[PDB]
Structure formats: structure tokens, C-alpha cells
RNA sequence: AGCCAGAAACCAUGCUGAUUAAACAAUACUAUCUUUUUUGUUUGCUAAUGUAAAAGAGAAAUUAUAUAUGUACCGGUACAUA
RNA sequence: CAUUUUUGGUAAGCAGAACUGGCGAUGAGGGAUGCUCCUAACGCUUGGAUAAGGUGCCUAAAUAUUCGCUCAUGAGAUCCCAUAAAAGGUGUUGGUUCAUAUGAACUAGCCCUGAAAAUGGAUGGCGCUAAAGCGGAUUACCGAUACCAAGCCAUAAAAAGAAGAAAAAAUUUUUUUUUAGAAUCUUUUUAUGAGUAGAAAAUCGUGGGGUUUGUGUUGAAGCGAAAUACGUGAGUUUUCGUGGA
RNA sequence: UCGUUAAGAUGGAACGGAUUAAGAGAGAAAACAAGUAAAGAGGGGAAUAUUCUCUUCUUUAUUAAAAGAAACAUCAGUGAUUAAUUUAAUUUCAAUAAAGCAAUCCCCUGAAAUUGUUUUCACUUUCUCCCCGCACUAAUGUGGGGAAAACUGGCUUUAUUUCUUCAAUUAUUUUUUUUGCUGAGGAAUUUUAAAAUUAUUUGAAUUUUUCUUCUUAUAAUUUAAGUUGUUUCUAUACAGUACUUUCUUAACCCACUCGUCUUGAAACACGGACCAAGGAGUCUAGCAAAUGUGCAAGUGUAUAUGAUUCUUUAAACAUUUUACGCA
């Protein structure tokens, strides 16, 4: 659903009303007076074949494959745990490079393209969504030093949520492995990270 | 910046809200704000407006005065702001209907007498809305004895105004500069 | 036509005719911005505060833009005013529904090419409080016929584009 | 500089400080106005002891309402706190600076009981 | 444009000071002392932290400026080289 | 006191006037520095874009672009404003007029000479010559308590006013929040905000009094140190310590 | 004013202002967790000494939730940016590839015989040729003197514009790339009505349309009708090194002794070593206006009398049917 005021054509997302105000005389009220909010849209270059850098979190500098845009304006991405340690992370795009290179141009891996989709296609927002429950039980073990560790990884790894994202995880890997990995240079681009040498101009290069 | 008289602050003049403490004349001003600020009749802004007045501006009212404002319409209600002061010089009274701030004893009692209604300002307004078939009318306000010790100033040409004296026999004030004999003349 | 003249001087230092006229052609606040309709009486007076003052004719996408993203509009009772940004028609439908040439439309009709209301319209426009020049002015120490830098003075088409950059 | 906290916005911190008080020690800390034929201070001279003015008020909707969101009530007896069961949400109690405390006391029980913050509460204990 | 001789003048030389440079070198002799590893620096005292500058903080010809540099012969000549 | 008009006086930061503006009583930005010059007049803030003026460094912006001129063995460099003339120059640069690509004569730009003073020494300083000099033109930029947008405050005016359920949480039924009508008052709107001499209003505090309803020996007043305290502010409030009515 | 300890500072004044910092103290009243259950300790209120019910403190554990701050995103408002765009208008142009035209010729521009207009001769190249100077030049060429041509330039035609052009400036318009800052308010009957947009529906119009217009009806929505959402974090905390905030030094930038008389004071003008307490527009008389208050052609009850008035009370109260003041 959308609308094309002045030709934009700008499409309507179903969003919550959840904050709430002490009114002018008597009761509270809803602050919100709309519904509808627009969708997100995205830098150009973005869509499923991408290979990209991720450039915020533990992971930086990695060299990661996008996989599916979840509807919510956040996008997932792999860069196949089996080669590069790279899990399936959701990230969002202004803390991901997005490079020119495209994997489905590679001859090889452009046969297997429905394929990767229909993997990617089970996986949604919803999956990656923390539960309340498990956050509590992680939390109640607080109150040595390698105990906590382990126990925090054994918490997280028991999660069904967790689990399901990890076997589409693996199965993506199993998936490409020795056809990304067949092309070398390729396979040690993807591996290497990502690096900003003194001979760089950032400003100045076509990224 | 910006040029402005005063500064664009806007100047209004007189009274702002009434002075006086008695509840009474509190709860008359309430009465007739809340008249004036809902119906857009005049009279009853004016007698909002004149209501506030100090005590030198309201003026007594003699009847025989009021008689002579009412005698070409003599059906009908004449209003005063003021207290209303009773008059020997005045022989008779024809019924008149009057509501006024205060009445003195006499006064009261003569229009009573003579068949005529006394009114105070909520009787006026509950009984008449608009002032509708009513006569603002108000006294002799310059004739004050004050007044005639201002404007165009004492001994200045022609100019009529009281000097102000002990006493005002033939050694006060009457010689040198009020005469062509003496000096100057007035 | 019309001219609009927009302000170019401080509040000090000022000659007192040259207040006077200022305060009649209604340019108060420095940068301040009127329409005034041409005649002989308005270009006299005019010539007086000139050093003071560019100005210069519209042309009909000046007037429009200006007018929208800038008109303020006399709300209130007579002599009372206080200043409404226009908004919507409602306003203007009151004031000028008696001259019909009520619509903001309309309004810009009326000064583009001086129609029959024109003093009322202009009127009861507040005055337009101008913004200052983009890429600044070049001075206000001289007239824009004088050789140099400089700006004061009538500046016939040129105005737009000097309305243009300071919107 | 500017010091917002959720609703509360006040502009100014620094308790103003009467001109001269730093290097003379007759010269009370508290505020006075300047009056002076030339004195820097009322010619409003750059960069010295800047002059308080009404314009830095507090916002008219939010004016006397301490941290505690709630406005500040001193209470020397619980008669006294007859009215502010109905104001529990809205206003704060502070036991009164004389009060004995055995009375002190009581005052916090009820205060409890009725629902409403005590700002001073540990007070002689 | 290029130059020269030329004054009790100027600056050295000379001479005085140099905790005027919060300046500095050499030398004689001397007080656990030195190195590596580890953990730490989260009764006036008796364990103990600071950075005006870490994130690849990369780069020794040398000489001109209306020409330079090597190399080979003997600043000259020839040939390369920026 | 400044421009302009102006009388006396050799002149004077001198004496006396005229018109206007200032300054006085007036900050702020610029003029290096300054009572008067320029800009611009000031509630408290946030962002924007400028003026006056600058943009080699001190110093925020250009070692900008573009065409000229200028070497100084005491260059020159910013209104007011912080000196310089008559007279010279086969210095260089343009002109203009004459004569037979040179001799004449003039002319005005910079430059030079004319150009001497006392503590050491002042383009504001360092410095600057393919200028950071002088004369332009061209852009771009930096640059205020001024300007625009927005918030907040007070002031001024204006609109305008003498009775009912809203939401959320639980698990359709229970719970939680609020539920306004004070007229010198409440809601809202828009404009505006310099100040000595001066005037006013609104507050605030001290000794005592009537009236009212309270704190005191499980410690009053006072005092010392304070306080996530409140107020624009005078102040008010409170904590701990002292204190003994 | 001075001592002790501790902490800090320390290159010819000291403090200061505006803004942050690093220390050092303080603190939880907003700065997380209502309820529910288990079982201790208290307190109450009601029903007709014991049933019911409301509670506060403790504990165990056990689910809420909200709140602020972040981060990104969506709007709206205000800006900055870098790309653009419509049909006009204004002496624009330029190629393209086939033809042609004139030779100091041509588009132009020179110099000459109440202003038009025409005519004279003057103006191009050259990597061409010739002659003298024969290498004479700064010159991979040349000084002088002659010719030549139309390659080059200029014009006329005919097609052609993505080979390459299609400008520039106004005029009227229409977008777009990044992006900075802002979010007051909170609508018991103007947070509606209308606008806009969507899916339908009816009739016209005309630029004739996958953003065509209007207007006929119905639903919805936001571009209307001032910011909302998701996820973190603080935090499964109880005050900690986090967080608030005082003080403390710093650091950038600024900043002259107050009072004072004065045209003009930071002054080489005067008064001020320091501190504490005291310390200066009052009271009466008579007059005035202002304003308040009572009465009103009157007004004031004077002196004084009178009272079961006699702590207060040295006040209050009272005054048989033209005293005096002012009016």
C-alpha cells in the first residue's frame, strides 16, 4: 500500500502506537496521531550479491556476503562461517560497506543462485529477535572469570531461535564452500581484511 | 533593532480594575464585566466602565435635576452611576423610576412617597438586560469647587481660575497686581 | 509599477526627515521589505531615503515566491494586529472578501501588476522581514551606479536576483 | 551553559555573586545590584560578574518542581498533612527542620501509610 | 649589471662578567647493583601511574633555478640519466 | 564632540555660533591601542546567513585568482588618526605636442632628493620585494549582543471563558494513572525587551502588635560547615555538627 | 588574625568571567521492577471474645512494567550542499558530407569621394615556388625582394545532428545527490471542516493522459491536524571507580581599584590597612492634590456631660423636638 503524492510513490508500513502522555485536563492519551509509517529504501548499490564490509562491531573489517533484506529496513548477512568465521549477522546499512563486487558474477556461483535464495528466503527479522526468557536466565547467573564465559556461550547455544539461524547458517556454508573456495584469489580476498594503508585517499578514491 | 513608539508597547489610559475593597462593589463589577464581556450592547460596557470610576468622578445627583432629564420620556428608567441627593428647592416629584449607587434618606423616602422605585445596579440588571427602555444619565462632574483653581493659571490674562488665600477679606490678595490701580491688573 | 524596496541601514545616526519618511513607507527593522506603488508622490519620497535603500521592479516569480514563503498577514482587530504567518485562506477571505480579491492567488495578482486594491493588500501585509544575502552584498557604503562596489539606490531588474539569493 | 533534564529545562547555574566579593573580604557573597557611577559591572563590561535579569526564569509550566517531579511541602505536624493525601502523586513532604523526633516519626509513618515521598527522611536517626 | 681602494665611525681580536645559558663538557674517586622473568600499580605515610600526543606516526644523495646528475677519458670534453 | 555652514584669532586638543546627529546616561562587533570614528543600539538560549571589516604568521579566512605599477646605502602599507612643502631628478613608467628613428619640448604615475632631536623603539609586532607593497578587477571565504527560523522568560496588548471519561496494564472481567472553573484567575495568541539623573509598581527581609495554628529538653533560638534543595533575584528551605532554652 | 596536619598550586602581582577537564568529596527524594506466593514480626478497621477484611516492616523467589540516555530509521520545520531540468526570449554556434563560389580576395574590417546610398584600393594563407643575402636565424631555418595556390580561411547551395555541436544570459518551470540543526504541543465537541492520497463510483472537459483534469457518491488513510518507531544500554542495579552534584586545580578566550565629584577616571584626581557591631529624608504643626471611606444641603459631636463604664478601660459606649468650625 503507498502514497504517490507529487509522483514519489513513498509505500505505507502498519507501525504501533506505544507512547503514551497525561492529557490537557482530565485522562492520558496515545501520543501518536498516524499508523502509517513510511518504508525505509536503501543506498543503490545494495541487493542480495553484494560482498561487503562490516565495519562496527568484534567482527570489523571482514569481508561479508549480504543475503536477505527482512523486510524491516535491517538486512542479513554471511560471510560463510565454514571459510571466513563470519556467522549470519544482522546488520544495518549504514554500519556496512557495500563493495562493487558481486558474487553471482563469479560463473560458477551463478548457477546456484535460487538455491541460496530459497535458504536465505526461511530466514526472517523475527529469527534474530533476543527472548526475554533466556536474557533473564544469563542475567540470574551474574550474582570464576572462565565459568562466566562458558556459561553465557552454553546459554546462548541451547536457544532454539539460535539454533534454527545456525543450521541455515551451515547449511548456506555447505552450500558455497568449495565453490567459492576453487576461485583462490577470490576465496584469500574474501578471507583478508579489510585495511586503510597510508597510501589511501578515502575522500578521494571510487570507493 | 526596531523604531517603535514607545518601544511597541501599547499605552491605554485610566483605571485598570477598581480600587476599592468593599465586597458589594466587587461583586457588582464581577456582575456587569460578565454582562458587558457576553452581550455586545454598549450600555452595559459603559456601565462596567463607569462603575470602576473614583470617587471625585461619579458626582452627586440632585432629584430636581434627574425630574428635568426625565420629563420628555417619563415612562421609562433613568439609570445614575452616582449617588443620588436629595434638593428643597424642589417643590414636587411625578413618580420617577431611578436606580442609582446609593440614596440619601430623604430622597428615598420622597420617592417612595411619592410613588416612584428605587433600584440598586443587580435589580437593574435582573429586571432590564440590555438597559432596554433605560437613560444613562450622570451629574455635574467639572463644577467641583476644586476645579476652579485649575487650567490657564491664576493672575496669567483673563484666565478665571481661584487663587488660594487665608481668608478672603480686603488685605488678602487684592492690591498690588490684581487692579489697574495697584501695578498690574488680573 | 510597483517597487519593492527593501531596507539597508541601522537604527542610528539617522537624519530626522529621513526617519519621518521611513516611518510613512514603512520600513522599520533593518532589512525590512515593502511594496509601494510608483507614482510621483512615492518616487519623491522615495529620492529622499534613497542613499538608505535599494529597490527595484519584481517580476512575477519573484512576487509568488515571496509571498508564500515569507508573507505574514494583519490578524487582528483595527490597530491591534498582531502578526499571523498566511497559512491558509480563511484569514485573507475575511479582510478582502469585501473587495473580492480574496485567495493568496489573487493577492499576487493584484501586486504583480497594480490592480484596483492595491492599497488595502499592501496594507494589510505585515512588512516582510528579509533574511540576509547568501554571498553577502558588496557595500552599503556606496550607491550600485557608482563604479565601485556598491549598492544603494534603484536597481530596476536586477532586485530579483538580489531577492533570490536573500529569501 | 543550558541544563535540561527530561521536562526540566533551567537555563542558568552558578549562583550570581555581588561584584568585588572575591578580593575584598567586607563585601557580602550574596546578590546586590551595582549602582555606581562607572564600575564595570552595571555598563555591562565583557567577561564580569554578569547581571542577573528576569528573562532567564524557569519555564511557567514547570516553575518550582524539584527532581523528585513532585512539589516541595514542609510539614511540622500530621494534622498538616490532612490535605496532601489528595496531592500524594504531585507533591513531597519535608519534615520541618525544628521537629523533635519522636514526632519526626510519626510524621514519616504516616507519610507511608499515605503514599507520598518524604524528601528528608533519615533526618535525626 | 659587474667590480676596487678607502675614516677616531661599525664588528671582531683583545680584555671583564658569565645561578647574565633556571646552560654545558671532560676527568678522579665513591654510594648492594645490574639483567631477565613473574604478578601488580581498581602514626602523615611505610606496595605502586604518568603522558601536548601510537594505531603502518615508512622514506640520509647532492647541486642548480635562463638546466642538473652520474659515468668514461683529460674544471674541460664525450656519452648516458631526472 | 563629529560632518557640513561658520565669526574672532598667526594658529591652537583655543575662543564663539548655525543645522543635524551623537556623546553624556550605552554596552556589543570593527577601527592594534582610544568617551565621541565606522557598524550596530543589548531579555535568556539553539541553529542559520551576514555587516562593518578582513583573509602570510601572531589571528578566524586565500601564501586566492587576474592585469598593471613599484628597489628605496633611513621603501611603502588601513576613514577619523596620529605630519610634511616649495623646488629639483639623463630613476623607471606611460602619455601629449613638435621637428627631420633619433633630437627637441612639455605632462603625470610610482620612486628618489629636499627630510634635523633628545629613555630604546615602533606599518599593532614578527616580517614582507614573482609582496603579505601600491592601483585596480575577479571570486570564494571568515567575521557581531545586528538579521532570519525555533525554543524559553517577563512586559504590553489582544482573543476568550462563571461539566464529561481518556488511556494503559492484567487475566470479556479485575487493577493502575489522571478527571481543571482560584476573574489582579485560567487557557491561548502576537508584538516587544538599552539605560545615569528621575518616577512608579511588584516583591523580599528585621524589632514589636492584634488575629489565627503551631515547633520545644527523644533539645528551641543562636552559631559552623554544607545541601542532586527551590527561587531570575533579594532570599527561602533543609542535612550534619555545635548549643542548652 | 594566627597555629597543626593533609591536599593542591608555584617563570615580574592575586583572585575573577564565559566553557569544558582532571581530581577530591557528597548523595538516591526521578535517576528500574507494581503485584503474586511462601513465613516471620507488627499494627488497624468492620461484622455478630472470634470470624471477616485493610495494611507497614522483615525476609526467601517470582513475573511485571515504565524511565532516561544511546543508535539508526520515518516525518515535519528550518537550513547547507551537487547534480540537474521546460517552453519561450535574446544578432549565439559548431561540425557532418556531397556540391559549388571569389583572389589581397572573402564573413568581417580598414583608408578615401545636410543623411541615405553606391564606388575606388586596403586587408588570406602557406609544411608551395622563384631571385638576391647563399646558412646570412633567437628559430629544424632565415633577412630582403618577387611570384603561386585556395590545401587553409571566408562565403553560397543541398541534405544531416549520438562524428561533433546544441552555448551564454535572462524568462518561466520542474526535479535531484548527499546531508546539519530543531520537535513547543497534547485538541470534554474549529486535531474538526476542508485539503492531499488510495481503492472503488458518475458525468463532463482537454494539454489525451500508467502522477489527465475537474466534479458525483462511498470507504479508508497523511503529504492534513508542531515526532514517532524499533533495538540496545543504565540493569536483573541499590550506590561503585558508573551516575548526580559541590568543591579543586587546570587549560582556551576574555578581563584595569571600588566609591566619587566630574564635559571627560584604570588614572600622575580625591576617600578606602583589616574586621565586627553601631551609623543618615524623620516627627509635629498648618496647607494641597491624589485616592480610599461614611454621611449628604449639610457635615464634624467641641469643650463637656451621662452611664451598675471603671484588670484591660488612659477605650468603648451614650448626648430631651438655633453652641462653634467649614460648607
Redesign the pocket.
Given at each position: 500500500?503507498?502514497?504517490?503524492?507529487?509522483?514519489?510513490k513513498?509505500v505505507?508500513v502498519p507501525?504501533?502506537?506505544?507512547?503514551?502522555?497525561?492529557?490537557?485536563?482530565?485522562?492520558?492519551?496515545?501520543?501518536?496521531?498516524?499508523?502509517?509509517?513510511?518504508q525505509?529504501?536503501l543506498?543503490?548499490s545494495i541487493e542480495v550479491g553484494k560482498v561487503a564490509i562490516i565495519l562496527t562491531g568484534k567482527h570489523m573489517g571482514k569481508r561479508c556476503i549480504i543475503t536477505k533484506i527482512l523486510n524491516s529496513?535491517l538486512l542479513a548477512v554471511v560471510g560463510p562461517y565454514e571459510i571466513n568465521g563470519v556467522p549470519l549477522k544482522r546488520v544495518?546499512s549504514?554500519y556496512l560497506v557495500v563493495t562493487s563486487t558481486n558474487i553471482f558474477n563469479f560463473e560458477n556461483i551463478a548457477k546456484l543462485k535460487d538455491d541460496f535464495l530459497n535458504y536465505a528466503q526461511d530466514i526472517d527479522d523475527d529469527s534474530f529477535?533476543?527472548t526475554?526468557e533466556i536474557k533473564?536466565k544469563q542475567?540470574?547467573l551474574?550474582?570464576f572469570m572462565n565459568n562466566v564465559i562458558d556459561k553465557i556461550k552454553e546459554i546462548r547455544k541451547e536457544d532454539p531461535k539460535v539454533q534454527k539461524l545456525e543450521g541455515i547458517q551451515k547449511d548456506i556454508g555447505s552450500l558455497l564452500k568449495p565453490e567459492i573456495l576453487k576461485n583462490k584469489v577470490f576465496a584469500h580476498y574474501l578471507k583478508s581484511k579489510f585495511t586503510?594503508?597510508?597510501?589511501m585517499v578515502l575522500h578521494k578514491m571510487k570507493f | 533593532?526596531?523604531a517603535?513608539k514607545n518601544?511597541?508597547?501599547?499605552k491605554?489610559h485610566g483605571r485598570k480594575?477598581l480600587?476599592?475593597?468593599?465586597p458589594y462593589?466587587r461583586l457588582l463589577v464581577?456582575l456587569y464585566?460578565?454582562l458587558a464581556?457576553?452581550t455586545n450592547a454598549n450600555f452595559n460596557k459603559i456601565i462596567a466602565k463607569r462603575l470602576i470610576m473614583?470617587?471625585?468622578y461619579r458626582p452627586?445627583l440632585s432629584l430636581s435635576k434627574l425630574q428635568y432629564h426625565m420629563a420628555n420620556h417619563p415612562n421609562d428608567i433613568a439609570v445614575v452611576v452616582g449617588?443620588i441627593?436629595?434638593?428643597?428647592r424642589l417643590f414636587s416629584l411625578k413618580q420617577l423610576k431611578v436606580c442609582a449607587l446609593?440614596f440619601?434618606?430623604?430622597?428615598r423616602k420622597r420617592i417612595e412617597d411619592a410613588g416612584g422605585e428605587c433600584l440598586t445596579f443587580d435589580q437593574l440588571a435582573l429586571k432590564y438586560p440590555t438597559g432596554k427602555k433605560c437613560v444613562l444619565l450622570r451629574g455635574p462632574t467639572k463644577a467641583r469647587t476644586?476645579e476652579k483653581?485649575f487650567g490657564k493659571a491664576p493672575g496669567k490674562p483673563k484666565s478665571k481660575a481661584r487663587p488660594?488665600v487665608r481668608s478672603k477679606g480686603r488685605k488678602f490678595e487684592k492690591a498690588r497686581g490684581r487692579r489697574k490701580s495697584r501695578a498690574y491688573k488680573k | 509599477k510597483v517597487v519593492f524596496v527593501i531596507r539597508l541601514?541601522?537604527?542610528?545616526?539617522?537624519?530626522?526627515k529621513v526617519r519621518s519618511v521611513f516611518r510613512l513607507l514603512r520600513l522599520l527593522?533593518?532589512?525590512n521589505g515593502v511594496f509601494v506603488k510608483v507614482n510621483k508622490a512615492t518616487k519623491e519620497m522615495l529620492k529622499i531615503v534613497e542613499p538608505y535603500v535599494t529597490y527595484g521592479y519584481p517580476?512575477?516569480?519573484?512576487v509568488?515566491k515571496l509571498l508564500y514563503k515569507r508573507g505574514y498577514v494583519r490578524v487582528?482587530?483595527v490597530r491591534?494586529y498582531?502578526?499571523?504567518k498566511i497559512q491558509d485562506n480563511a484569514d485573507i477571505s475575511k479582510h478582502l472578501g469585501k473587495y473580492n480579491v480574496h485567495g493568496i492567488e489573487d493577492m499576487v495578482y493584484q501586486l504583480y501588476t497594480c490592480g484596483p486594491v492595491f492599497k488595502k493588500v499592501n496594507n494589510f501585509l505585515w512588512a516582510f522581514?528579509?533574511?540576509?544575502?547568501?554571498?553577502?552584498?558588496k557595500?552599503?557604503?556606496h550607491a550600485f551606479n557608482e563604479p565601485?562596489?556598491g549598492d544603494w539606490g534603484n536597481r530596476e531588474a536586477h532586485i530579483?536576483?538580489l531577492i533570490n539569493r536573500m529569501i | 551553559?543550558?541544563?535540561k533534564?527530561?521536562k526540566i529545562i533551567?537555563?542558568?547555574?552558578?549562583?550570581?555573586?555581588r561584584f568585588?566579593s572575591?578580593?575584598?573580604?567586607?563585601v557580602k557573597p550574596?546578590?546586590r545590584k551595582?549602582?555606581?557611577?562607572?564600575?564595570?559591572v552595571?555598563?555591562?563590561?565583557?567577561?564580569?560578574?554578569?547581571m542577573?535579569?528576569?528573562?532567564?526564569?524557569?519555564?511557567?509550566?514547570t516553575?518550582?518542581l524539584?527532581?523528585?517531579?513532585?512539589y516541595?511541602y514542609?510539614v511540622?505536624?500530621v494534622?498538616?498533612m490532612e490535605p496532601l493525601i489528595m496531592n500524594h502523586?504531585?507533591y513531597?513532604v519535608?519534615?520541618?527542620?525544628?521537629?523533635?523526633?519522636?514526632?519526626r516519626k510519626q510524621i514519616i509513618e504516616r507519610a507511608?501509610?499515605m503514599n507520598v515521598?518524604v524528601?528528608?527522611?533519615?533526618?535525626?536517626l
Open positions: 500500500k503507498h502514497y504517490n503524492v507529487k509522483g514519489k513513498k505505507l507501525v504501533n502506537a506505544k507512547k503514551t502522555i497525561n492529557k490537557k485536563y482530565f485522562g492520558r492519551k496515545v501520543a501518536s496521531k498516524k499508523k502509517y509509517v513510511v525505509r529504501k543506498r543503490k529496513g544495518d549504514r529477535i533476543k526475554l533473564k542475567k540470574k551474574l550474582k586503510l594503508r597510508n597510501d | 533593532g526596531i517603535l518601544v511597541g508597547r501599547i491605554k480594575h480600587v476599592s475593597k468593599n462593589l464581577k464585566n460578565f464581556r457576553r473614583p470617587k471625585r452627586p449617588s441627593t436629595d434638593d428643597k446609593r440619601t434618606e430623604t430622597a476644586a483653581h488660594y | 541601514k541601522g537604527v542610528n545616526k539617522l537624519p530626522p527593522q533593518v532589512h517580476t512575477l516569480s519573484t509568488r487582528g482587530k491591534r498582531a502578526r499571523k522581514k528579509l533574511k540576509p544575502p547568501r554571498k553577502g552584498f557595500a552599503k557604503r565601485r562596489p530579483n536576483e | 551553559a543550558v541544563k533534564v527530561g533551567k537555563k542558568r547555574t552558578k549562583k550570581f555573586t568585588q572575591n578580593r575584598f573580604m567586607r550574596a546578590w551595582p549602582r555606581g557611577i562607572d564600575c564595570r552595571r555598563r555591562r563590561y565583557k567577561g564580569t560578574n554578569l542577573p535579569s528576569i528573562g532567564y526564569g524557569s519555564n511557567k509550566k516553575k518550582f524539584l527532581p523528585n517531579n513532585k516541595k514542609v511540622k505536624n494534622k498538616e502523586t504531585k513531597c519535608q519534615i520541618a527542620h525544628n521537629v523533635s523526633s519522636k514526632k507511608k501509610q515521598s524528601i528528608n527522611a533519615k533526618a535525626r
